[PDB]
Scaffold this active site. Structure first.
Site, PDB file in Angstrom:
ATOM      1  N   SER A 192      19.836  -6.548   1.185  1.00  0.00           N
ATOM      2  CA  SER A 192      19.140  -5.786   2.150  1.00  0.00           C
ATOM      3  C   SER A 192      18.235  -6.645   2.971  1.00  0.00           C
ATOM      4  O   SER A 192      18.229  -7.810   2.823  1.00  0.00           O
ATOM      5  CB  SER A 192      18.382  -4.682   1.467  1.00  0.00           C
ATOM      6  OG  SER A 192      17.202  -5.179   0.950  1.00  0.00           O
ATOM      7  N   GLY A 193      17.527  -6.009   3.882  1.00  0.00           N
ATOM      8  CA  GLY A 193      16.438  -6.578   4.624  1.00  0.00           C
ATOM      9  C   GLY A 193      15.535  -7.502   3.876  1.00  0.00           C
ATOM     10  O   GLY A 193      15.371  -8.592   4.324  1.00  0.00           O
ATOM     11  N   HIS A 194      14.990  -7.089   2.727  1.00  0.00           N
ATOM     12  CA  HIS A 194      14.166  -8.048   2.002  1.00  0.00           C
ATOM     13  C   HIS A 194      14.968  -9.288   1.622  1.00  0.00           C
ATOM     14  O   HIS A 194      14.446 -10.403   1.627  1.00  0.00           O
ATOM     15  CB  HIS A 194      13.571  -7.403   0.748  1.00  0.00           C
ATOM     16  CG  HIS A 194      12.511  -8.230   0.089  1.00  0.00           C
ATOM     17  ND1 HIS A 194      11.410  -8.708   0.766  1.00  0.00           N
ATOM     18  CD2 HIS A 194      12.384  -8.664  -1.188  1.00  0.00           C
ATOM     19  CE1 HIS A 194      10.651  -9.400  -0.064  1.00  0.00           C
ATOM     20  NE2 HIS A 194      11.219  -9.389  -1.256  1.00  0.00           N
ATOM     21  N   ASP A 230      24.712  -5.031  -6.267  1.00  0.00           N
ATOM     22  CA  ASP A 230      25.560  -4.201  -7.113  1.00  0.00           C
ATOM     23  C   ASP A 230      26.116  -3.010  -6.339  1.00  0.00           C
ATOM     24  O   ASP A 230      26.841  -2.182  -6.890  1.00  0.00           O
ATOM     25  CB  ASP A 230      24.783  -3.714  -8.337  1.00  0.00           C
ATOM     26  CG  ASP A 230      24.555  -4.812  -9.358  1.00  0.00           C
ATOM     27  OD1 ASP A 230      25.090  -5.924  -9.166  1.00  0.00           O
ATOM     28  OD2 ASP A 230      23.841  -4.564 -10.351  1.00  0.00           O
ATOM     29  N   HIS A 251     -10.371 -16.771  -2.109  1.00  0.00           N
ATOM     30  CA  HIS A 251     -10.782 -17.515  -3.299  1.00  0.00           C
ATOM     31  C   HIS A 251     -11.009 -16.584  -4.519  1.00  0.00           C
ATOM     32  O   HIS A 251     -11.573 -15.495  -4.368  1.00  0.00           O
ATOM     33  CB  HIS A 251     -12.056 -18.351  -2.984  1.00  0.00           C
ATOM     34  CG  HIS A 251     -13.202 -17.523  -2.470  1.00  0.00           C
ATOM     35  ND1 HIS A 251     -14.165 -17.000  -3.305  1.00  0.00           N
ATOM     36  CD2 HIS A 251     -13.510 -17.096  -1.224  1.00  0.00           C
ATOM     37  CE1 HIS A 251     -15.031 -16.300  -2.592  1.00  0.00           C
ATOM     38  NE2 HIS A 251     -14.668 -16.360  -1.324  1.00  0.00           N
ATOM     39  N   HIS A 282       2.961  -6.026  -4.832  1.00  0.00           N
ATOM     40  CA  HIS A 282       3.417  -6.379  -3.499  1.00  0.00           C
ATOM     41  C   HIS A 282       2.235  -6.258  -2.508  1.00  0.00           C
ATOM     42  O   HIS A 282       1.716  -5.165  -2.271  1.00  0.00           O
ATOM     43  CB  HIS A 282       4.506  -5.430  -3.054  1.00  0.00           C
ATOM     44  CG  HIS A 282       5.065  -5.742  -1.696  1.00  0.00           C
ATOM     45  ND1 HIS A 282       6.034  -4.967  -1.107  1.00  0.00           N
ATOM     46  CD2 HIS A 282       4.767  -6.718  -0.791  1.00  0.00           C
ATOM     47  CE1 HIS A 282       6.336  -5.457   0.088  1.00  0.00           C
ATOM     48  NE2 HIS A 282       5.587  -6.521   0.302  1.00  0.00           N
ATOM     49  N   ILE A 287       1.090  -2.397   4.740  1.00  0.00           N
ATOM     50  CA  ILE A 287       0.931  -3.205   5.952  1.00  0.00           C
ATOM     51  C   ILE A 287      -0.487  -3.129   6.538  1.00  0.00           C
ATOM     52  O   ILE A 287      -1.046  -2.038   6.770  1.00  0.00           O
ATOM     53  CB  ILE A 287       2.016  -2.872   7.025  1.00  0.00           C
ATOM     54  CG1 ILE A 287       1.910  -3.858   8.197  1.00  0.00           C
ATOM     55  CG2 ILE A 287       1.947  -1.379   7.453  1.00  0.00           C
ATOM     56  CD1 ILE A 287       3.212  -4.003   9.088  1.00  0.00           C
ATOM     57  N   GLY A 342      -0.714   1.699   4.177  1.00  0.00           N
ATOM     58  CA  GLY A 342      -0.764   0.920   5.433  1.00  0.00           C
ATOM     59  C   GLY A 342      -2.066   1.156   6.195  1.00  0.00           C
ATOM     60  O   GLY A 342      -2.492   2.292   6.363  1.00  0.00           O
TER      61      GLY A 342
HETATM   62  C1  COA Z   1       0.452   5.977   1.721  1.00  0.00           C
HETATM   63  C2  COA Z   1       1.958   6.188   1.598  1.00  0.00           C
HETATM   64  C3  COA Z   1       2.436   5.500   0.324  1.00  0.00           C
HETATM   65  C4  COA Z   1       2.160   7.692   1.405  1.00  0.00           C
HETATM   66  O1  COA Z   1       3.491   8.076   1.680  1.00  0.00           O
HETATM   67  P1  COA Z   1       4.004   9.570   1.317  1.00  0.00           P
HETATM   68  O2  COA Z   1       3.590   9.938  -0.088  1.00  0.00           O
HETATM   69  O3  COA Z   1       5.513   9.592   1.474  1.00  0.00           O
HETATM   70  O4  COA Z   1       3.214  10.522   2.364  1.00  0.00           O
HETATM   71  P2  COA Z   1       3.765  11.147   3.756  1.00  0.00           P
HETATM   72  O5  COA Z   1       4.361  10.061   4.629  1.00  0.00           O
HETATM   73  O6  COA Z   1       4.728  12.300   3.558  1.00  0.00           O
HETATM   74  O7  COA Z   1       2.409  11.720   4.415  1.00  0.00           O
HETATM   75  C5  COA Z   1       1.516  12.552   3.692  1.00  0.00           C
HETATM   76  C6  COA Z   1       0.152  12.590   4.389  1.00  0.00           C
HETATM   77  O8  COA Z   1      -0.564  11.378   4.201  1.00  0.00           O
HETATM   78  C7  COA Z   1      -0.769  10.736   5.455  1.00  0.00           C
HETATM   79  N1  COA Z   1      -0.557   9.279   5.351  1.00  0.00           N
HETATM   80  C8  COA Z   1       0.590   8.633   4.953  1.00  0.00           C
HETATM   81  N2  COA Z   1       0.380   7.302   5.072  1.00  0.00           N
HETATM   82  C9  COA Z   1      -0.884   7.100   5.539  1.00  0.00           C
HETATM   83  C10 COA Z   1      -1.626   5.945   5.837  1.00  0.00           C
HETATM   84  N3  COA Z   1      -1.188   4.744   5.454  1.00  0.00           N
HETATM   85  N4  COA Z   1      -2.919   6.073   6.313  1.00  0.00           N
HETATM   86  C11 COA Z   1      -3.484   7.322   6.473  1.00  0.00           C
HETATM   87  N5  COA Z   1      -2.753   8.456   6.171  1.00  0.00           N
HETATM   88  C12 COA Z   1      -1.479   8.344   5.711  1.00  0.00           C
HETATM   89  C13 COA Z   1       0.202  11.370   6.443  1.00  0.00           C
HETATM   90  O9  COA Z   1      -0.267  11.354   7.771  1.00  0.00           O
HETATM   91  C14 COA Z   1       0.296  12.780   5.897  1.00  0.00           C
HETATM   92  O10 COA Z   1      -0.791  13.551   6.375  1.00  0.00           O
HETATM   93  P3  COA Z   1      -0.642  15.132   6.704  1.00  0.00           P
HETATM   94  O11 COA Z   1      -0.169  15.850   5.450  1.00  0.00           O
HETATM   95  O12 COA Z   1      -2.001  15.641   7.135  1.00  0.00           O
HETATM   96  O13 COA Z   1       0.380  15.320   7.813  1.00  0.00           O
HETATM   97  C15 COA Z   1       2.737   5.608   2.810  1.00  0.00           C
HETATM   98  O14 COA Z   1       2.511   6.335   4.003  1.00  0.00           O
HETATM   99  C16 COA Z   1       2.381   4.158   3.079  1.00  0.00           C
HETATM  100  O15 COA Z   1       1.228   3.858   3.835  1.00  0.00           O
HETATM  101  N6  COA Z   1       3.175   3.221   2.567  1.00  0.00           N
HETATM  102  C17 COA Z   1       3.088   1.855   3.038  1.00  0.00           C
HETATM  103  C18 COA Z   1       4.437   1.279   3.465  1.00  0.00           C
HETATM  104  C19 COA Z   1       4.286  -0.162   3.955  1.00  0.00           C
HETATM  105  O16 COA Z   1       3.193  -0.628   4.383  1.00  0.00           O
HETATM  106  N7  COA Z   1       5.422  -0.867   3.905  1.00  0.00           N
HETATM  107  C20 COA Z   1       5.374  -2.323   3.803  1.00  0.00           C
HETATM  108  C21 COA Z   1       5.714  -2.940   5.141  1.00  0.00           C
HETATM  109  S1  COA Z   1       5.428  -4.732   5.165  1.00  0.00           S
END
Ligand code: COA
Ligand code: COA
Ligand code: COA
Lengths: 194, 194, 194
Positions: free
Chosen positions: B12-14, B35, B124, B133, B154, B172
């Site tokens: 995949s991407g990663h 797999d 540090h 991660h 992120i 994020g």
């Molecule tokens: C926090 C997180 C884990 C939650 O995901 P989830 O459980 O699937 O939640 P949902 O996407 O369905 O959203 C649920 C609620 O939380 C909020 N929410 C989700 N991510 C958020 C974030 N990072 N900051 C603030 N609010 C967030 C949504 O806006 C939503 O609000 P609402 O109910 O009022 O509409 C996910 O959004 C996240 O930030 N994962 C990070 C992914 C990432 O950074 N990838 C790596 C790339 S290098």
């Protein structure tokens, strides 16, 4: 090959950083054109590589069009410290700016007229649409699609797999957490329509 | 010394970015095992260095366990542009990913199976727990303890001296400003339990 | 030219990273002075370059004053990976710290006693006031004026053309979106007075 000199159109702040990147690439002289209070563009100018150092996406696109129409080559300015995957695609001679410490990972694609500003990150498999501006420290996670003419503000980010519709703005510090198929201005953490 | 080739598990991407890091380290060939719809892992494979290119922390740990159990060496993939203090400790041959422009400062410790993603910063005296991660652009200030299996999204950050309990998620763009001894999902600026 | 050895005052965490930068610059030995539980500063010490490795802006300024008054030279510590525009101005021998992957763009000015911490970005034409601390991953957009003694927290940012008044704090993760002529503590996205 690149010419000895380069025309940089825009002599403002954005122009100054573009100058630094051109010098980093090995250009010997940068000739500033600014229709405002420097040397004016003229269709009659001696041929050299061109760069459009205009931060505004709409105006950069129009100027790009006018310069291209006069038969000038609008090169990419890519700082040597930018790290670009061998499988990433960067549109050739397309007025793209890639600033210091930018990272572009596997299979990402960068379209014409894009600015990737200082320390921005474009993760694997992204598509960054033409004349978008991903500004300082902004980051797109894997598989993100940024539409044409979009502007991602300072220190903003977009979560994996998301799309931002053409002509949208993600404000400074905003975190885009949901797919956006309709254009708008999104601000906050999480990012919400203004 | 490193082998001539490397098995990358995850295509995949990663996997693609892991490939780029392996090539940067001087590996001549990357053999993808997936797999799912590529070449399957087999316990009978000819011996080469392995890397587990799986973003999910839970699944990366399990696969790591299965590969290790078959006697394969799971190396670290560390991009040459990562800046690691001579006094930092990075667990050897422990399936750790360190992406481009990552910085790890004095006396920080990185445990097995960690991903430090693009342009992340570990200040540090940090301790980053096994199979965590720290994603793209996420930053931990001085003396921060990240628990096992944690995920920092992120552009997230953690203020100095703080701990995040095992199995937590910092969303994020989130800014963790208080000590967290009980696991959860924390989002926003400041970060608050979801 | 730089001396063979350097005195680093502060032997804490900030001191350790300063040590790493001094070694990167080619200093052969770092002698830690810490009035607390290491070797004490003495006005009678053999002459070598000095650095004040104190994170607190108020205390760093006072110590800087005391060391300077005894006739010691307080050098800048600038990591080799910092990218500094040929037109940027960095006050010479002024106790300035510039950490790894810091970028300082065209015509920016950095004043005495400033810390630019890991992966911070100072855009074109910024002015960073004396004894300010721009911390890890904090970013100032073009033409931003940071006042004396200011502290920008981890992963904070300031939008273009803005000023932050002397003695202000921008909290970790904060996004400053309006001009601030009166001092205070600003937190959130957008940043608001505490
Ligand atoms: C926090 C997180 C884990 C939650 O995901 P989830 O459980 O699937 O939640 P949902 O996407 O369905 O959203 C649920 C609620 O939380 C909020 N929410 C989700 N991510 C958020 C974030 N990072 N900051 C603030 N609010 C967030 C949504 O806006 C939503 O609000 P609402 O109910 O009022 O509409 C996910 O959004 C996240 O930030 N994962 C990070 C992914 C990432 O950074 N990838 C790596 C790339 S290098
Ligand atoms: C989002 C943005 C486009 C909106 O600008 P605008 O239309 O002129 O809006 P204003 O500045 O007048 O502010 C309007 C409201 O939105 C808020 N706002 C503006 N920018 C914001 C941001 N990025 N995050 C959260 N809120 C924001 C303001 O606080 C204000 O709120 P209020 O009415 O309650 O007082 C702009 O603020 C922005 O973030 N641009 C990014 C610039 C940038 O990053 N430059 C590149 C540097 S490398
Ligand atoms: C802003 C700051 C200076 C305030 O600290 P403080 O005066 O001790 O405040 P507290 O930690 O007791 O918290 C007070 C309130 O402000 C909030 N707050 C603190 N820091 C915040 C931040 N950066 N963003 C949003 N809110 C914040 C807290 O959540 C708390 O809210 P509550 O009363 O509703 O529970 C501090 O939190 C900070 O951000 N410092 C930056 C440190 C840093 O970045 N170090 C450099 C590492 S490289």
């Amino acid at each position: 090959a690149r010419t000895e000199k380069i025309y940089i159109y825009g002599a403002s702040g954005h122009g100054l950083v573009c100058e630094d990147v051109a010098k980093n690439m090995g250009y010997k002289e940068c000739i500033f054109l600014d229709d405002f209070k420097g040397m004016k563009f003229e269709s009659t100018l001696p041929k050299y590589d061109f760069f459009i150092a205009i931060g505004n996406n709409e105006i950069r696109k129009k100027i790009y069009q006018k310069i291209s129409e006069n038969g000038f080559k609008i090169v990419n300015l890519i700082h040597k410290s930018a790290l670009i995957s061998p499988s990433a695609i960067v549109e050739e001679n397309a007025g793209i700016l890639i600033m210091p410490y930018v990272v572009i990972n596997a299979k990402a694609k960068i379209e014409k007229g894009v600015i990737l500003n200082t320390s921005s990150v474009i993760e694997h498999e992204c598509v960054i649409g033409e004349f978008s501006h991903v500004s300082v420290g902004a980051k797109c996670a894997g598989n993100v699609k940024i539409g044409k003419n979009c502007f991602l503000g300072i220190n903003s980010c977009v979560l994996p797999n998301l799309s931002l519709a053409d002509d949208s703005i993600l404000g400074g510090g905003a975190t885009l957490v949901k797919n956006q198929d309709e254009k708008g201005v999104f601000v906050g953490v999480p990012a919400k329509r203004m």
